[PDB]
Each structure stands twice: as C-alpha cells, then as structure tokens.
Design a protein around this ligand. Structure first.
Ligand SMILES: *Cc1c(COP(=O)(O)O)cnc(C)c1O
Ligand SMILES: *Cc1c(COP(=O)(O)O)cnc(C)c1O
Ligand SMILES: OC[C@H]1O[C@H](O)[C@H](O)[C@@H](O)[C@@H]1O
Ligand SMILES: OC[C@H]1O[C@H](O)[C@H](O)[C@@H](O)[C@@H]1O
Lengths: 813, 813
C-alpha cells in the first residue's frame, strides 16, 4: 500500500486523443474554471485565453514526458545562454507543431467562435532587440525539433523592447507591458529560486579565497515550453526574475532596488552601453544559470564537459567563464588547471558583429566593486593566457599588448571577447564572410595562436514560423507538389526547381504573393488607416534603424524615383510601394533623425498629385516579429543594403528569400551565401565589395567627390539642405546632410550610383511578371541551406558533440 | 446557428457530484496540467496546491452561479470598504463550508497522501493588523452565509502584517512575502482595471469644477471567492493593486513609485500615523471602489440608495463621502442637495475606538496638494453642516468650534470622524458600552444634533472558523447532543445548559480541552522546541501589544506568583503555563520594551529549579490568525484586562468563550455583555469600572499611593529597577518603571490588588475540575449572542435595509 498508491498519480490519460469533442469540453472547462467567466460576459480576449489554456494542456503532457525521458536517458545537456529571446506569438506555433490546428479550428467553429479572430488577440513576447534575440528563438525551435536536450537560459524582463509610436513623424517609446493580461505559457517555479551575490570583498583564508560581505538578490525561474515539430519533444526556456531576499515601511519599499535587475531590456541593438545595471543583469543570469546547471549535473568534474555544453550568445553571458572557475576552484575546491580544462571544454562563444562600438569592454573599476572575486579570476586567466602567447611568440611584446584581456588607457577595461576566446574551446562567426573577417582582422592574433578554435556556423531561420505559419498559402501550393517532408528537411525545396517551367506552378506562386499583398493592404487599412496600392511592387526594408544598415541609401533612391517622375511626369514607371520599418535605440540621435526623414519624404511624395499611385513611401510603425510575419510574405523586393563587411549575417534576408521576394543587396553577411545558393543571375547584387571598402579607407573616403560628380545626388542633397522636405523647419535635416557629406563611416554616396542602376534592373524584370515569378521560384527552391535546422545540426556535431535526431517520442497516453 | 452555438458554453456539469472518484481524477489533472509536476518530483507543497486547485473548482462553479443569480434578481448591493481584511487560511474553511472535507480526506488517503499534513502547508493571508481586519473577515463569512449580495472592497497589499521573530528576547520584523508561492484562490482581473487620480488642481469653467493636471495610478482588481455555510452562495472580496499608467530606462524603473501604493500594510493597530502614502492608499481604494459601484449600478440617481449601501470600516475609507459627492456633482452634474441626500442615504460609519491617538486628523496642507477638489468639497460640506448646527443651537459658538470638520491650530486638520458623521445616515459603536460612551463623550454634540443616527452593533465572530474549524473535538461532542443546526444558528448552544449536570457531557468537555492542550504542546515542541506542561492551567493573553490592553498588568501578576513561590517554596499552588503573545507596531517603543520584559521574566522563572513545572512564562512568537486557531482551543483562562473604557469591544474574548475557556477581565467592551449572557457568577470580572476610572481622573491618578500602600507591588518594582530581570543591563527596564510610577495613562497599579485577588479565585476553582468544567459549560452555552451572524443580521435590518436569508441556491449542475 502507501507509496504504491501514488502510482495512480500519472499523466497516463490527458485532455484527449487530439480531437474535436474533447477540445470543446476542455475549452468550456477552462473558460469557467480557469478564467472564472461565462458566455454572457466573455470577450474575444477571454475566449482566446480559453483556447490557449486548452492547447497548453496538450503541450504540458508532452513537456512532462520529455523531461522524464531526459532524466532516464541522461544525454549530454546543452545550455544556450542569452540576454535575449525574441519569441513572438505562441498559440499558432504550438497548434502547428502539435498538429492541433485543424481540430481546434473545428472545435471553435462548433462553439460559435472564429479561431483566426482569437489568434490575433495574442501579442508578441518581445524580450529581444532584433536579429540576435530572434536567432536564439529560431534556435530553440530547431533544437527541440532535432531532439536535443537543450535549455535556453535568460532573464524574464518585465518590459521587453518598447512599443514604437509615430507622433508627428517621430518615434516615441511606450513601455511594452507584455504581462498585463498574464502569460498562460510560462510556469512560475518559486520552489527553485536561487541566490545571486553582488559587491562584497575577497578574503584569503588558510584554505582558499572567500567572497564575503555580499548583498543578495534572489533569482526566481519561470519555465516556458518549446515544442519540436511533430516529434512530441518539448524542451524548456528558463528565464530568471529578480526578487529581494527575505524605518520598516521604507525597507519594504526599497526591495524594488533588487527587483530592478529584471525590470527592462536594454533597447540597444549592435551598440555597447556600459551601464552597471546591465552588468548586474549579465551576472544575474550567469550565476543563477550555472548553479542550476551544476545542481542538475549532480542529480567528479572530469566528466562535466561530457554532460554539459554552455553556448555563449555574444559576450553578454561571458562572465560564465570566470563564474564557473570561481565555483570549481573556490567552492568545489578543484585545482586551477583541472578547473580551467573543464571550463574551456564546456564553453563555446558565438560572435555577432565586427563593429568596435558594439563590443563589450567593462571598466575594471566597475568590475572590482561589483564583482571583486571575478576580476581577480579574470586577471589570473589573463596572466596564464599571456604566458602561453609569450611562449608561442617569444619577444613579441606588441602581441601581448594586443591579445591581453586587459585594455590599458586612462580607463582600464576588460575586453570580454578576449575573455571568451581564451576560455572557450570553440569560437564562431555567423556567416562565412563574417567568420573569415574574424580570422584576419579583429581576432587574427587569436586565430594564429589557436587556429583549431575558429569555426563558422551560418545563421538560419526556422521554416515552421517563417513559412508554414506566416505564409500558409505558400506552404500549401508547395506541399501540393512535393509533400510535407520539406518542413523539417528544407533542402527538399530544391525539388521545386523542376517546376520552373510549369505554368500551373508559376500561376500559383504569383497568385499566392498577390493574395498576401491584398491581405497585408487590408491589415494596414484596418489598424493604421493607411492605403497602399496592391498592384505595385512591394519594396521592403524592415530591420532596426542603423547607419550601417543604410536606410539612408534607400532614402536617396526614393527621392531619386520622385525627382525622376517630376522631371518626366508622363513617362511610365513600374509602380512601387516602398516600405521602411524598424526601431531606433532611444538615445541614437541619427537613427531617430532617419526615421523622421522617412516620414517627411512620405509627406511630400504621397501627397503630390502628379505622382499619384505610381510611388508611395510608408514607414511601418512598430516593426516586431508579429509584423514581420505579416509584411514579409507580402514583399516583392527585399532590401539588404548594409555596407560590405558590416552586417555579420542578417536573418531577415533569409525570411524574405523563403517567402517569395527577390533580393537587392551588397555582398555582405549571408547575402553572399544566398546569392551562391540561388546563383547570382537570380539575385540583384550591387556595390562595393569588402575589398573595395578597404581600398577606399586606405586612400581616404571623400564624399564630396561623389557629390561633385553626380548631378542627381547633388539635387537631392540640395533639397534636404533646402528644407524641401521640411518647409516649416528648413534646417531640420542639417545633421543628416553634414554626416553624409563629411563624416559618413558607411559610405552611402559611394554606393548610390550602382544602387540606383541595380534598382532599374529590378523594375525592368518586374515589368515581366512571368520572368519575375520564375526567378522567384529559383530563390525559394534554393533557400534550404538557411533553415536553422541546418545551423543547429552543425553546432551539435561540430561544437557540442551531440547527434541530432528526428526520432519521435510517443504521445503522452 | 451562430450565437446559438455558444449555448454549449455553460457551467452545466463540473468537476463532479462531490465524491471521491472525481476528486481523485481532478487532483491528478491539476498536479500535472496546472502545476506541471509529476509524482517523482512532487513535494508536500505541490500536493497541497493540487488539492487546493481541486477544491477551488467546486468553489468557482458556485461563484459563477451566485453572480448570475445576483444579476437576475438585482438585489440591493452591500459594499464593505476596509483597508484591512485578515483572512487567514482558506483550504479547510472552503472544504467545511462546501461539505467537501470527508470526501477530500478519503480521496487524498486513497492516493497515498495525508490531508492534515497538506492543510498545514498553507499560511495565513494577513492583510490586517488584528481585531478590525479580522472582524471584516468574519463579516464576509457571515454575509455570504446570510445570503446578502455583499462585496468586500480593499487593497491587495504585496506584504501583509510582518512576521514576528524573537531574537535575544526582542521582536524583530520580517516582511511577510505571502505571495511567494502564489495565491490559488484569487483571480486577477486586468480587464477591469480603473484609473485613480492624484495631485493636480481645480479650475472653474462655465459649467462646473474640473479636476485637471492630475497624475494617474491604475487600480487593478483581484477577486477572491468567499463561501457561505452550505448554501452554495459564494460572494466576492475585491482587492485593488496599484499599477503605473502606460531617460528611457529610468522612466521604466520609476513606475515603481506608483506601484508602491499597494506595497505594504501600515502595521499600526489603534494608532494614527499621518503618512502621505497611507492617505494615497485610502483614496486609492475609495476612488476605484466607487467607480466600480457606479458602473455596476449603471449596468437617475434617486434610486441609488435603494440599490447601494456603502459601509465604512472606521474612518479609513471616509474619503468615499467627498468622492461620491465629487462624482455626482462634477461628473454626473447633479445639484448639490440632491447629491448630498443620496450620499447620506448610501453611507454608514462604524467607529472602533475612543482613544484620541487612534483617530484620523489629516493636515489640510496634505489634502490640498494631494486631493485639492476633495478639500474644497469637504469645506463646503462643513459650511452647510455648521449652518445646520447654528440653526439648531442658535448662538452656541463653542459647539460650532467643537463640531467643525476643521480643527484649528498651528496645523489645520480635517477630523475624518466628524466628516463621517455628517455624511452618513448611521453611525455605530461595536459594543453596548462603547456605543453609549460614544453618545456621551466624543460624539455627544453630534448625538444631540442627530440622535436617530446613533446605533450599536455588538461585534461577533464566525462560528465556522472559530468553532467548527479550529476545534473539531468540541464541535463534535456538541453535535452529538444537539445536532448541527447551531452552526448557522449559534443561539442553539443554549440547549447545552440542559447538560450542566450530565456526567458524560462534563467528562467530554474536559477530555476535549485536554486533548487540545496536549496537541498544542506537541505543536510548540515541534516547531519552537518549547516544552509546556499540559497538566497545568493554560493562562492566555493573545492580542496586539498595547499599554491600554495592559499586558504589563499580567506581567505584575506573574512576578507576583513567582515571588510567592519563592517566599513559601513548599506551599502547593495550582500549576500554570502563562502564555502572552502579540505583535508591537515597529515604532512603538514601550510595546517593544514590554515584549522584552515578558521574555526576560521567562528567562528567570523558567530556569529557577525551585519553581520547576509549577509556573512557566512563555511569549508566543508571531501571533496571527492561524496561531489563534491553535492556542485558543487549548486555553483555560482568557485574559481580557484592558482599562475600563478603552477596549471598544474586543473579539478575541468571544473566541475564548466559544472554545471552552473561562474569562478574567474588566467591565470593558464586549466583556460586559459576555458576563451578562453567562451570568457574572460564571465569569471573573474585577477592577475599576468606567465610573471609577473617571473619578480617579477627576482627582488625579497618583501611582505612588498604590506603591506606598502595597508591599508586594513595591517588591516587584524594586526587582525591575534593580536589574533582577536584566542582570547584565540593570537599567534596561527603567522606561517601564518610570512610566508605571509617573505617566501611566492606563492605571496599572490601580487594578493590581483586585486583579491578584481575582486570580486567586480562578486558581481556587481550577483546583476543582468538576466545578471548573461546569462553569465552562455555562459559558459555552451562552456564547450564542456573539456569532457574527447575529451582528450582520442587525446591520442588514437596521442599517442596510436588506433581509437576511438562509435560502440555499441549487448546486451548479
Ligand atoms: C528576423 C528579424 C530581425 C532581424 O532582421 P535583420 O534584417 O537580419 O537585421 C529583426 N527584427 C525582427 C522583428 C525580426 O523578425
Ligand atoms: C481575533 C483576533 C484578534 C483580536 O483580538 P482582541 O483581543 O479582540 O484585540 C487579533 N489578532 C488575531 C490574530 C485574531 O485572531
Ligand atoms: O547572428 C544573429 C544576428 O545578430 C546581430 O543582430 C547581427 O547584427 C546580425 O547580422 C546577425 O544576423
Ligand atoms: O471592532 C473590531 C475591533 O476593532 C479594533 O481593533 C478595537 O481595538 C477592538 O476593540 C474591536 O473589537
């Protein structure tokens, strides 16, 4: 008896076989017992929640079984540490990966509800800035689909990336209260809360170093399930929330100081701000995470790297290296060398940018008072690492200065990237050209010392959210010719090359794109009361606003199109709707000026009667993952025009390719590989190559030369300076003009002519619908390489030492 | 079709008929799908939660049906506004009121679990200080049991009353993180969030006054169900939580300033601290609550008082009077007189104390900057009210000064009590002697102007939590002679007088008390490693520490008992375990010194070998509702010794009476009525009566007179002064001695002799178990009047204008 009785406590049978009668029963149960509502007062939001809780049950049954499986099998575990996870919406993705969509649609329909209406109630979970955070999300999806025992570890920010409002043509920021109505997917785990220490000092007793007199902040984990595609594997994303440890009133009010650590996501994309609060955030996630990892490993350390892999997403969680050493040496009392060998074999670092202003260099004064023991450990790591450099390159003192983890100057700093290379067994770039640039520029010295460490892992996007979910029309016409295997084996899209001359397929691809454009236009009119002509080429550039991404170059082209129509009003031109969207970091003055310029150009272009519906410029407000899922499937032309050598990889580019848009871009990041897969003849590559940018830097970039030699460019700069785009405040864009003319690090003028000419060729091909569509088919069919399943498979085999698998686990019952 | 399909969405059938097989099924469901756990990792806490969620389902089904019933019947609604609701534990109370206890016990037993272990996992919801907050909780229970459409309205504090730790014999405060693990009973209602305004200014436009330029704080409601006893009626307690309205980082961090309004309960019991944060809390609950009330009434105002009753628990929510006037006049644009007539007919005020330092008088400077429009309205109310006084008492200018809502001085203040009397149709005291003291002392002037307003509503406690729940042994031996009708008709206990000479009943009452003492001793040893001799008289004084409650008088008696044993070591004395417990407000120096004195006396008494087990003094740490439910059923003697005229009513006194303890106390508060019900011959009344205290005040209280005339008292004061109870710090209690000797507002010395003598008589009767028990039966049998069902029935018929009912609603299915 006794404990044997508890055997009845099983997940044995759950909310159903996955069909209509039971879905309806559970939906009714949740509407009343979970939400405490009834049909008389229920709102569409209430019904959305009832459907979400219903679907969550099926997810939870699999989640429990997956974790029970991992405990029994005891596979090597992969921990993906990131300060960002841009997850987006969850309801549809869950229904799709669990094959519940059809039944839920019928169940809601029979109850007198419309599921598509419900689905649109859900808003993004935006705990990320853009590319890096969304890559982490795509990776989570892929690791689950590939059966890896992976855990995503980050911070549960109370407020994710701000909501962007456009007022008077300018960006205004609004806090993203994403949890107001709650989050039905996450599960609070207060019982697993852990302490994280700050400040204090180090004392050296007889048996080692001791970090004492610290202030404590508790880390409370919240777990979110992440489902693999139809394999019944559900992995976990664990995010930490800061809590205060446990006169009088003020002491209780002051608990907010500790809880501020997880209050808001720093809104910087590709830019380092050395704020102490940000440093606390980084150590917070690292300390709680590693405790969790070691605890889980325990329920000696020679086998740790055989059971644990820690992947560092950028240098954000780099403190994991000195923290793991601290724990092993100070707490587990292992000798230094043994601990270091363990640390290096466990950690791997992924770099995401080559721009100096984006890399982390923390002032040592900040590190000595907030984390004294870590700074001590960092200096010791440096000394031993430099000893190795000196032995490998005797007498090369300059190299010692260059490779040091410590940067000298008035403000002493720790170069976190060097710390990561020294403490990781693998370091990777995110696109072939980027990983190569790494090996011969910023990390050349390190590659020369340890060549074996340097790898490449070209980025990817998940075909579930970025094709099956966001573009059902495209997914179905594709499935009708090659089946559904491609969904978890994207290289099968290659089979579509056999239909490049098939009249029905050409017909279908174009009909789908058009249906998408029609629907997107309906979306814009509905929620923003913005009209766009669907029988125009949808020219889209959506990504964070940056000088390096060159939205300004796009701007020059749009003004070029406008001026050309005014010059010859009665000459035909392929009608276009140029859409530019993206958020600017709150303190990035130029990026905000750029947003104002885009809206100001629209104010002129969209209201000039001679232009009419031949050209329209729209700034897409609040670009985020849910908007990307909408606009990308409706795009004809994808703008990927960063200065060659600046965009490490890009991923938006891959989304557009997979969804039927042709690409105009530079030979930068992954564009290079996309062009290689599709064939340059099916791409619109233009401008300076990395070699060309470098030669210009060698001789000196003089924008005045281009200005003096290109009349059409001069006309535009004169209009800007003139106040033609800001009549009421003539000098409004003076900062943009001066930067372009005298301080342009990204050489906009140098690529202007080739850009305008390439755009002419784009228009030329669009004039011929049949050939445009045929080229589109050639892009879609060769986008297979950019599935994040491919990327993750490589990380697993070449870095983590684990074998990917499409073995499915049995359904719960 | 269409909307007709939604008819399937019904509470129709729920988690079961209320029996074992289905309880087990749902418990299993919640353990896995709600908690995301399994039997391998589940902890007792996890299982407690699974049982709580299981029981919650049954509660929710009734909650939905009750609210649907109220909408259809449209009864007059009662709103009980309080800044405190001391709810305590919910699981058992819920099982008892829904008659689910037996089945849940069997269901858990069959699953290999022990329900009593699970139940003890739950901790109190302590959003109250003591008597006033617990009265509100007892009232909620009774209103639901009496079928009234009642709603309790308050604030959802993040931290309730602090947890008291005793360190080195002193009280230390620890924040009560009551929500750490969550609260399964409440339901967040973000969709019903409302705005509350602060600061700003008033401008007088052409059509009225306008409150502009305010700062907004949002009020988000959380609803908790409160079940009536077996009538399937489930009412609501709605508590508001503060949220901020919707460079950049600091602006987001600063949202905490607004959310601080609902962060912590001010820990003052019977004492006014005019802190601005407290004023914000009061207006916060009032503004959100009244909006809610008017909204609910709308889905003209002449009928408002026929549909609405607003009861003000103390002056805490007094701003409801000027706020309702503001809304009616400024927003609904009604004329002043009509609005005032509506306001007075809607509001009623309950006073809870006569001590001057406990009453609210807000500085007008504070009110003019935080709530300018309310201060304007308050001055207008005052002017019109004083005009009425002047007409009723021509030429009595002193009366005008005395009754004014405005108190003059260096610091101008608004007397909130006067505001309440002026704006309410009923004003009540909480015990006969208190309501009479009100009529002839602090509110004499108002009673003379409007005698019809003044009422009495003697307090009560609910027999569900305070008998059936906390003392199952007593409840069953009672049920075996008179059935269970008494549970919701306590006057039936009167039937037990027929068993005062019944040998089996006498036997049973004493066996139950003894079982209770044995179990309480087991509890103390288990969790505090404190031994107490169960074959000793349990002398208990549990309530907040206060000079007016005279724990110090108790202290004098204990030292008297100790000195007497030392004087005649070999003389027999009835063995006693004197227990004193209760929290002191954090800033109340004397109360904290008193706690230290209690522990210091114990340090001497409990370790003196001559005394041994004949006398033991214990300070019960962290007295709270859950401890009261434990210690009260084990008490033999109830200490209710406040100076006559200071304790408005008391309720702990009623708890002890209902649970089998005899009472030693003054003729104060409800003690008077308890003595009247049981007969003074069955009580231990002693000391000065109100008349005696007053005569002493007239001539001047000189404590030295008593000191000079009572040798045993002098001995004690000498020991205190001496350092006999603090050898290492001889003058530690100098402040207590000086206050007693020279500044004792509560005349401890004046009641010492009669107190000691009365205690001798208590011991005399305890020596005779049969007669002690017979007197106990006479107390229990006459405690019926103190059921809060009686109290609420009176509020309903004499103030609210609604008829109580024991009609049961059908079970959900
Ligand atoms: C894919 C994605 C990105 C990354 O876009 P890039 O053009 O590679 O910088 C940024 N934001 C969102 C919302 C995304 O979906
Ligand atoms: C009943 C109760 C009170 C009120 O006690 P009095 O002696 O009337 O002041 C205070 N605290 C708790 C925890 C209670 O249960
Ligand atoms: O690696 C994921 C992404 O990280 C950063 O956002 C880089 O700017 C981008 O090029 C890269 O694609
Ligand atoms: O009215 C409920 C209670 O309120 C206050 O705590 C009074 O001190 C007390 O005497 C009264 O019983």
């Amino acid at each position: 008896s006794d404990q044997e009785k508890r055997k009845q406590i099983s997940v044995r049978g759950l909310a159903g076989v996955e069909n209509v009668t039971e879905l309806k029963k559970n939906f009714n149960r949740h509407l009343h017992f979970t939400l405490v509502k009834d049909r008389n007062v229920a709102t569409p939001r209430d019904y959305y929640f009832a459907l979400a809780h219903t679907v969550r049950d099926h997810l939870v049954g699999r989640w429990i079984r997956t974790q029970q499986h991992y405990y029994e099998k005891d596979p090597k575990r992969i921990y993906y540490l990131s300060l960002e996870f841009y997850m987006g919406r969850t309801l549809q993705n869950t229904m799709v990966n669990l094959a519940l969509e059809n039944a839920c649609d019928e169940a809601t329909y029979q109850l007198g509800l419309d599921m598509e209406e419900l689905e649109e109630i859900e808003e993004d979970a935006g705990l990320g800035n853009g590319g890096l955070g969304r890559l982490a999300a795509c990776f989570l999806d892929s690791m689950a689909t590939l059966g890896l025992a992976a855990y995503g570890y980050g911070i549960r920010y109370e407020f994710g990336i701000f909501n962007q409002k456009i007022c008077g043509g300018w960006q205004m920021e609004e806090a993203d209260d994403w949890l107001r109505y709650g989050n039905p997917w996450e599960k609070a785990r207060p019982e697993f809360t852990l302490p994280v220490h700050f400040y204090g000092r180090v004392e050296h007793t007889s048996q080692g170093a001791k970090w004492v007199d610290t202030q404590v902040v508790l880390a409370m984990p919240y777990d979110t399930p992440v489902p693999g595609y139809r394999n019944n594997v559900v992995n976990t994303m664990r995010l930490w929330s800061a809590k205060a440890p446990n006169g009088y009133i003020q002491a209780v009010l002051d608990r907010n100081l500790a809880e501020n650590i997880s209050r808001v996501l720093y809104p910087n994309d590709n830019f380092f701000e050395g704020k102490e609060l940000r440093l606390k955030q980084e150590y917070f996630v690292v300390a709680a995470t590693l405790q969790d990892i070691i605890r889980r490993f325990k329920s000696n350390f020679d086998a740790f790297p055989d059971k644990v892999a820690i992947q560092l997403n950028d240098t954000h969680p780099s403190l994991a290296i000195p923290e793991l050493m601290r724990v092993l040496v100070d707490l587990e009392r292992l000798d230094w060398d043994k601990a270091w060998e363990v640390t290096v074999k466990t950690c791997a670092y992924t770099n995401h940018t080559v721009l100096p202003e984006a890399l982390e260099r923390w002032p040592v004064h900040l590190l000595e008072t907030l984390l004294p023991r870590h700074l001590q450990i960092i200096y010791e790591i440096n000394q031993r690492f430099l000893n190795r450099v000196a032995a490998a390159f005797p007498g090369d003192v300059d190299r010692l200065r260059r490779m040091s983890l410590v940067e000298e100057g008035a403000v002493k700093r720790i170069n976190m990237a060097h710390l990561c290379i020294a403490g990781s067994h693998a370091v990777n770039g995110v696109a072939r050209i980027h990983s190569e640039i790494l090996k011969k520029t910023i990390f050349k010295d390190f590659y020369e010392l340890e060549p074996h460490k340097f790898q490449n892992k070209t980025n990817g996007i998940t075909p579930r959210r970025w094709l099956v979910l966001c573009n059902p029309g495209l997914a179905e016409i594709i499935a009708e010719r090659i089946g559904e295997e491609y969904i978890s084996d994207l290289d099968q899209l290659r089979k579509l090359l056999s239909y490049v001359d098939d009249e029905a397929f050409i017909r279908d691809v174009a009909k789908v794109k058009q249906e998408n454009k029609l629907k997107f236009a309906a979306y814009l009119e509905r929620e923003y009361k913005v009209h766009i002509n669907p029988n125009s080429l949808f020219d889209v550039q959506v990504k964070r606003i940056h000088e390096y991404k060159r939205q300004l170059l796009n701007c020059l082209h749009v003004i070029t199109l406008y001026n050309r129509i005014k010059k010859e009003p009665n000459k035909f031109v392929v009608p276009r709707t140029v859409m530019i969207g993206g958020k600017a970091a709150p303190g990035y003055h130029m990026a905000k000026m750029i947003i104002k310029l885009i809206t100001a150009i629209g104010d002129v272009v969209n209201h000039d009667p001679v232009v009419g519906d031949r050209l329209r410029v729209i700034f897409l407000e609040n670009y985020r993952v849910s908007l990307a899922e909408k606009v990308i499937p409706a795009a004809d032309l994808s703008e990927q025009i960063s200065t060659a050598g600046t965009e490490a990889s890009g991923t938006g580019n891959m989304k557009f390719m997979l969804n039927g848009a042709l690409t105009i871009g530079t030979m930068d990041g992954a564009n290079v590989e996309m062009a290689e897969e599709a064939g340059e003849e099916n791409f619109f590559i233009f401008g300076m190559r990395v070699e060309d940018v470098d030669r210009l830097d060698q001789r000196g970039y003089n924008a005045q030369e281009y200005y003096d030699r290109i009349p059409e460019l001069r006309q535009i700069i004169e209009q800007l300076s003139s106040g033609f785009f800001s009549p009421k405040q003539p000098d409004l864009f003076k900062d943009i003009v001066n930067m372009l003319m005298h301080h342009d690090r990204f050489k906009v003028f140098a690529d202007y002519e080739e850009y305008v000419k390439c755009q002419e060729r784009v228009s030329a091909l669009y004039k011929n619908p049949r050939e445009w569509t045929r080229m589109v088919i050639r892009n879609i069919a060769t986008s297979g390489k950019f599935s994040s399943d491919r990327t993750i498979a490589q990380y697993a085999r070449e870095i983590w030492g684990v074998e990917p698998s499409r073995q499915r686990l049995p359904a719960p019952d």
